[PDB]
Amino acid sequence: PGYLNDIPRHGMFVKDLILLVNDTAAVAYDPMENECYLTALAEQIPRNHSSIVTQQNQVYVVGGLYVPLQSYFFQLDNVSSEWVGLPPLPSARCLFGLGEVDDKIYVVAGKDLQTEASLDSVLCYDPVAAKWSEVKNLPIKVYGHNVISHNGMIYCLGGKTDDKKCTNRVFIYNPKKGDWKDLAPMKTPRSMFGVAIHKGKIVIAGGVTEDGLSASVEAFDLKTNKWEVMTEFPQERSSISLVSLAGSLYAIGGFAMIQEFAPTEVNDIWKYEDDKKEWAGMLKEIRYASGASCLATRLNLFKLSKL
Amino acid sequence: PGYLNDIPRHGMFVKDLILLVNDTAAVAYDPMENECYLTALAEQIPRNHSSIVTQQNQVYVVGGLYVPLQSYFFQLDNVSSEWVGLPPLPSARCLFGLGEVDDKIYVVAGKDLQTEASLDSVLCYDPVAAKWSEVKNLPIKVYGHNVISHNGMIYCLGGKTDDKKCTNRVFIYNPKKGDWKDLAPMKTPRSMFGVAIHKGKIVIAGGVTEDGLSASVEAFDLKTNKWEVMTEFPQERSSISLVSLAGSLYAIGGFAMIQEFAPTEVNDIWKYEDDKKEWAGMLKEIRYASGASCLATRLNLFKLSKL
Numbered sequence: 001p002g003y004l005n006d007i008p009r010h011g012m013f014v015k016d017l018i019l020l021v022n023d024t025a026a027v028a029y030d031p032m033e034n035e036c037y038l039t040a041l042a043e044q045i046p047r048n049h050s051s052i053v054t055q056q057n058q059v060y061v062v063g064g065l066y067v068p069l070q071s072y073f074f075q076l077d078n079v080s081s082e083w084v085g086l087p088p089l090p091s092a093r094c095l096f097g098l099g100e101v102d103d104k105i106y107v108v109a110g111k112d113l114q115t116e117a118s119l120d121s122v123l124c125y126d127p128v129a130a131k132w133s134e135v136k137n138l139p140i141k142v143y144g145h146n147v148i149s150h151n152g153m154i155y156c157l158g159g160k161t162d163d164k165k166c167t168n169r170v171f172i173y174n175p176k177k178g179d180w181k182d183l184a185p186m187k188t189p190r191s192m193f194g195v196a197i198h199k200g201k202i203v204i205a206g207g208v209t210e211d212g213l214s215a216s217v218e219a220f221d222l223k224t225n226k227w228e229v230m231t232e233f234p235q236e237r238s239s240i241s242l243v244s245l246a247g248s249l250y251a252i253g254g255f256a257m258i259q260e261f262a263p264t265e266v267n268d269i270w271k272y273e274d275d276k277k278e279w280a281g282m283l284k285e286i287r288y289a290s291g292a293s294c295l296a297t298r299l300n301l302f303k304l305s306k307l
Numbered sequence: 308p309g310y311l312n313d314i315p316r317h318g319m320f321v322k323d324l325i326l327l328v329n330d331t332a333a334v335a336y337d338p339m340e341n342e343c344y345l346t347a348l349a350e351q352i353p354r355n356h357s358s359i360v361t362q363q364n365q366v367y368v369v370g371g372l373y374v375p376l377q378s379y380f381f382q383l384d385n386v387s388s389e390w391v392g393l394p395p396l397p398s399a400r401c402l403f404g405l406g407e408v409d410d411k412i413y414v415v416a417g418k419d420l421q422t423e424a425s426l427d428s429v430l431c432y433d434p435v436a437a438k439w440s441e442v443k444n445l446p447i448k449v450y451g452h453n454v455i456s457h458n459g460m461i462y463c464l465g466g467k468t469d470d471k472k473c474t475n476r477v478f479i480y481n482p483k484k485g486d487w488k489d490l491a492p493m494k495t496p497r498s499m500f501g502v503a504i505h506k507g508k509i510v511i512a513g514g515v516t517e518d519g520l521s522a523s524v525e526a527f528d529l530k531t532n533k534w535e536v537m538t539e540f541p542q543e544r545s546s547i548s549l550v551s552l553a554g555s556l557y558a559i560g561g562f563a564m565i566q567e568f569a570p571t572e573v574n575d576i577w578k579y580e581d582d583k584k585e586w587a588g589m590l591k592e593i594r595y596a597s598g599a600s601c602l603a604t605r606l607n608l609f610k611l612s613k614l
Contacts, residue, residue: 001541003575003588004341008595010614011342032339034311035318234308268310281310288315301608307317 013301016246018269021061022291023047026076027307028299031250031269031282037304040081046072051293052098052105059295060105065092069114073125081303089123090132097147099154101175103127106135108156111143118143118162122173136178139171144191148202150222155202156180158190166191166210170220186227188216194240198249198272203230205251206237213238213257231277234270238263241294248272251279252294265290320608323553325576328368329598330354333383334614335606338557338576338589344611347388353379358600359405359412366602367412372399376421380432388610396430397439404454406461408482410434413442415463418450425450425469429480443485446478451498455509457529462509463487465497473498473517477527493534495523501547505556505579510537512558513544520545520564538584541577545570548601555579558586559601572597 017028019039026040046064049072053059059076061083066072071089076082093110096119100106105125112119118141125132138156145159145167154173161167166189171180186204193207193214201219208214213236220227233240237254244250249272256263267289269282324335326346333347353371356379360366366383368390373379378396383389400417403426407413412432419426425448432439445463452466452474461480468474473496478487493511500514500521508526515521520543527534540547544561551557556579563570574596576589 001586001588003591005589006591008336008590008593009342011337011340011344011611012613013608015340029315030318033318033322035316037318279308281308282312283315284310284313286315301320304318306319 015299015301017297017299018243018245018250018252019051019053019059019295019297019299020252020286020288020292021045021049021051021059021295022288022293025288026059027288028304029269029286029288031245031271034283036286036288036307037301038307039299039304040076040083042083044083045074047291048094049293050096050098051295052100053295053297054100054103056103057298058103059297060086060098060100061293062089062096062098062105062107063094065113071113078300078303081305087125087130087132091119091121091123093119095143097145097156099147099149099173101149101152101154104175106147106154106173108147108154109138109140109142109145109159117141118160135175136173136180139180139182140167140169142167144208146193146195146204148195148197150197150200150202152176155183157195157202157204158186158193158207160191165189166208184220184225184227186218186220187229188214188218190214190216192238194242194251194254196242196244196249198244199274201228203242203249205240205242206233206254207240208238212236213263231272231279234279234281235266237266241292243294243296245296249274250282250296253289253292322606322608324604324606325550325552325557325559326358326360326366326602326604326606327559327593327595327599328352328356328358328366328602329595329600332595333366334595335611336576336593336595338552338578341590343593343595343614344608345614346606346611347383347390349390351390352381354598355401356600357403357405358602359407360602360604361407361410363410364605365410366604367393367405367407368600369396369403369405369412369414370401372420378420385607385610388612394432394437394439398426398428398430400426402450404452404463406454406456406480408456408459408461411482413454413461413480415454415461416445416447416449416452416466424448425467442482443480443487446487446489447474447476449474451515453500453502453511455502455504457504457507457509459483462490464502464509464511465493465500465514467498472496473515491527491532491534493525493527494536495521495525497521497523499545501549501558501561503549503551503556505551506581508535510549510556512547512549513540513561514547515545519543520570538579538586541586541588542573544573548599550601550603552603556581557589557603560596560599
């Protein structure tokens, strides 16, 4: 038979790890070794926030209030493991999406924190010139949507539109011509859900629906590009965090419904088994996942600390 | 559903790795990350040698000649990554087996390097008093057999007996009463083969037989304790090195038959997939496996060097 690999690499002490950032710390987690490390303390990181990692290994956080009423913007300094304050998001905003192409970061839509109104406004931070600006607005006003980046394109999915219904709409942003396009919609309109790239499909997991909590897993093949169904999540949950770690799709946490019965956070980890098509329970409880945004990243081991 | 793990551990920078020791270096290999590191240089390590790791993380090597005509005995100093010369094996000997219980190391049988004769003689090295002695002789004279240790017991398997036929005999050594016992024999008499503990069965892989090269995989359940058959190796090979790494059974290298057609070393890695019952090709070529004894060990990452 054939082999997975032809020649071995020389290791450099770099590990693909799940980075869990909440308001106490950014903790690195290795699901295969069931072990955690400290990457950075995070006492200044706002409890309600979104997170993104470049490409380069640059972690950015957007969220909270303020530092004209605004939102914080941080970059993790990988050399010092200190969080850097950056030009703040001009808008105080929640329940938005975060994208990124060629080092530039995109905050899409919201949920104005002052006004309570839905936004279509898209802000792009340029890290060379160190400044934010308004690019083309999203075709809808929305919050509760999710955003992911792939091959220099930005995708916006689901959300709640300006009535208060969930939307199934899917939009693509080309930075090099600056327009949004509707793509084929998802089967299940949803907000507050998990998203990741997984070979090379946009996978979406659970959420709130017109029927409330969902365990539905869909995938947009990037590609046909059609929507197809994957094995449903073991439990109906909102705000599952999906991450692609090396070859594999992980699911971290999410909410509810548990027991008077209310949406309540579960701090567990699951892994999709591609062969078999099953969700496998990895870790029952990880306290570091509580309140945490979740990211796959390539970390230098000798920059981590023992917990 | 349930979960594999309940609580996460705090990582300590320790990794289960395949240690490949030959006459140039001891190279650590991570089959899951397809990466290698240097653990120690090994220019003094004899090309024909056997290897064993304690329990504690102590690597010993026996082989070659000499330093009354003897064999070298080395211990890897984990702190300095230097090989320590230890009291030499009183006997110059090859094609023996290596065992170990409670820090003591056992050299069983051979293949006298001076005399050419098969031995039944068993030598035990005591590391506290730093000295070798003769314990109870094996019930047969044999070479080409293999030896593994489990739960304070030592097992001796196969080999060529004093005629020149392969044997199917299996012996257990209890150090605390000092006797050898025949256990149930294997189905296929063999010499020059691979052995490992795998849940909690003594797995044996390939070898030379009365029919020459074998791809046969058997397992002694430790336990029924009966012999059962596993999925045959992809190729008939002698001297496959078997290692249990964390949950998983790996097979490294072995010989032949290739192409005038002669037994020739293949420097590849395979992994048994327990679910499915298949051998999966991991790595086509690893040059560090050439001439190498192979061991699963728990290494401190910050003690390794970049290659």
